[PDB]
Ligand binder design. Structure first.
Ligand SMILES: OC[C@H]1O[C@@H](O[C@@H]2[C@@H](O)[C@H](O[C@@H]3[C@@H](O)[C@H](O)O[C@H](CO)[C@H]3O)O[C@H](CO)[C@H]2O)[C@H](O)[C@@H](O)[C@@H]1O
Ligand code: CL
Length: 413
């Protein structure tokens, strides 16, 4: 029996995973046993397995975790699998770079599925506000003027019978910079930069502060209600679904969720699901970026089932499994060839995610990435708390990212 650990990638994820692997099981005369870890906990259990030598054969990883787990020395080389799937050629570079610890000789993860972030919008709220989405999502200035028109609008969701918040974004200490990265990048900033053979914080670069301040100050100007500042990602998701928000940033999953009854983990019933639009991040002063992520699969080098686990990695990474699991999850395949399936191309909301991928940007794949993102989100949490007071100024934000930067630079030395 092979053991795979996965995250909750679909409404019934163990059952979707098991339907996905049934033909591998039949062709190999083997049973796969799946365990589903919540995203909130999956980090700790995966790190405990890596530290103790007790764990599955395969584990899903966040693309941004592959570096740290690889540096713990517990991942089996999978260059052989990536070759059987078509090698570097078979992947966007953004995806290809997630297959290894930055600068390591050997690949240690197999790309499974991709996700990137774009804005969902209420077509009804924007039509009623008189906002042309092409203009609002073209530029930072067009975005700010579309929120202003959304704030002034008479519109009220027909279910809630109240106004929509123009923008909903969470102010709770985030787990990651996924929401914030597009604004840092669009200003010409970065989280860390490589120069003179070392990585250092760029979160206190004037470009980073411009981007971050522009994002956080929207909330300060009235385009994000005080209630949103008190919420985490999952709560903002729920708020868009329940008709409280006209615009918010998420992954492609919400498209397949909008086509699924409430009773099945969806909101097809709700207005928002009937009035659903997608648009890319607006271009910033120094170009157009969005966070590009997903999950890879890794094999623990203490696995007793390496040969079969490798066949399972080639099965899951290959074209048929890639198409099939992207359809159940609402994600994108990791494999470029699999994007051509009509199931992705003739879905007009998903087609927008596909166009957005041109401007997908990734984290460098560093052993210490986790430590970096954790001090950054701590300081960014304190910034959100100043926005909850009306008291985020450029000075206070610079003071917080200087402290983040000094604590990030220690971590990297
Ligand atoms: O930072 C770790 C890791 O984060 C990954 O982002 C995930 C999101 O992909 C995930 O989205 C969930 C869907 O996957 C699932 O199907 O639906 C639920 C609700 O129905 C969604 O929340 O949410 C988690 C928790 O916030 C995020 O961590 C990145 O893609 C990966 O690149 C990164 O390494
Ligand atoms: Cl944020």
């Amino acid at each position: 029996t092979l053991e795979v650990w996965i995250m909750p990638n679909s409404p019934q994820p163990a059952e979707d995973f098991k339907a996905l692997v049934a033909p591998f099981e039949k062709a190999h005369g083997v049973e796969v046993k799946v365990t589903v870890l919540d995203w909130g906990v999956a980090w700790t259990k995966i790190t405990t397995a890596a530290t103790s030598g007790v764990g599955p054969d395969l584990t899903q990883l966040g693309t941004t975790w592959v570096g740290a787990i690889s540096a713990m020395g517990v991942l089996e080389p999978v260059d052989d699998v990536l070759e059987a799937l078509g090698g570097e050629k078979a992947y966007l570079p953004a995806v290809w770079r997630t297959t290894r610890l930055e600068g390591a000789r050997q690949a240690t993860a197999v790309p499974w599925f991709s996700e990137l972030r774009a804005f969902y919008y209420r077509t009804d709220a924007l039509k009623a506000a008189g906002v042309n989405p092409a203009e609002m999502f073209a530029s930072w200035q067009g975005f700010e003027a579309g929120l202003a028109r959304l704030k002034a609008s008479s519109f009220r969701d027909p279910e809630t019978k109240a106004p929509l918040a123009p923008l909903c974004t969470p102010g709770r200490t985030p787990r990651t910079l996924h929401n914030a990265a597009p604004w840092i990048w669009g200003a010409g900033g970065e989280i860390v930069r490589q120069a003179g053979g070392r990585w250092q914080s760029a979160l206190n670069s004037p470009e980073s502060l411009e981007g971050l301040y522009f994002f956080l100050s929207l909330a300060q100007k009235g385009y994000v209600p005080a209630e949103s500042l008190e919420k985490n990602t999952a709560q903002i998701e729920a708020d868009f679904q329940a008709g409280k928000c006209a615009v918010f940033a998420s992954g492609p999953w919400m498209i397949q969720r909008a086509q699924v009854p409430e009773a099945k983990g969806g909101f097809a019933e709700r207005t928002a699901a009937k009035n659903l639009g997608v648009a890319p991040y607006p271009a910033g002063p120094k170009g157009r970026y969005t966070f590009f992520g997903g999950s890879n699969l890794a094999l623990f080098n203490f696995s007793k089932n390496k040969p079969l686990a490798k066949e399972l990695l080639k099965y899951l990474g290959g074209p048929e499994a890639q198409v099939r699991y992207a359809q159940m999850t609402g994600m994108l395949p990791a494999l470029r060839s699999a994007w051509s399936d009509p199931s992705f191309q003739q879905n007009p909301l998903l087609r927008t995610f596909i166009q957005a991928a041109q401007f997908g940007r990734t984290y460098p794949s560093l052993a210490g990435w986790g430590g970096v993102e954790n001090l950054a989100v701590q300081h960014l949490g304190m910034a959100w708390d100043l926005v909850a007071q009306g008291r985020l100024t450029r000075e206070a934000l610079k003071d917080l990212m200087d402290k983040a930067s000094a604590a990030i630079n220690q971590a990297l030395r």
